[PDB]
């Protein structure tokens, strides 16, 4: 639904690195170099950001409002 | 088919960009249509594509 705050395995704070990640995708950056620039060294946080699907806005499209 | 008639037809549905022909925005987005992703009116989509 939404990006988890913490990485599941290690526990590094990953919730605050989501929208900026999207900015790097809004820029010309690839996935790997954007993850490197965000500072995700070990592959668990890279899996956290890379494999996350942002369903929150799609659900909000069905929100009452 | 004669080239002049084809040119006349394509000038009414396409524009010239770098020597190629790109379909006009209004052709892709009719006045009753809207963005499938955001639902904005087709006029805004036409302006953005222009």
């Amino acid at each position: 639904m939404i990006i988890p705050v913490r990485c599941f395995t290690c526990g590094k704070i990953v919730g605050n690195k989501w929208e900026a990640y999207l900015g790097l995708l809004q820029a010309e950056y690839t996935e790997g170099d954007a993850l490197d620039a965000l500072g995700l060294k070990r592959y668990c946080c890279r899996r956290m950001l890379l494999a996350h699907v942002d369903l929150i806005e799609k659900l909000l499209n069905y929100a009452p409002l | 088919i004669d080239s002049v008639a084809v040119l006349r037809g394509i000038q009414k549905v396409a524009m010239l960009v770098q020597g190629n022909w790109v379909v006009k925005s209004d052709i892709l987005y009719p006045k009753d249509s809207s963005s499938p992703h955001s639902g904005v009116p087709a006029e805004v989509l036409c302006r953005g594509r222009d």
Binding site: I2, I13, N16, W18 | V44
Partner: protein, 49 residues
């Protein structure tokens, strides 16, 4: 109250549509206000969605 006619992006249409952790406000109890200088007690990252 002031936005463009289209405003496809939610940022222009809406305000406070993303609840960042900077919206958290510390509420002192007792004498904690005196003991802790302002700005010491806060969420660490300030940008968590």
């Amino acid at each position: 109250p002031h936005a463009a006619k289209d405003s496809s992006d939610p940022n222009e249409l809406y305000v406070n549509h993303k609840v960042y952790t900077r919206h958290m406000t510390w509420i002192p109890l007792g004498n904690q206000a005196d003991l802790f200088p302002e700005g010491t007690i806060r969420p660490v990252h300030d940008d968590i969605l």
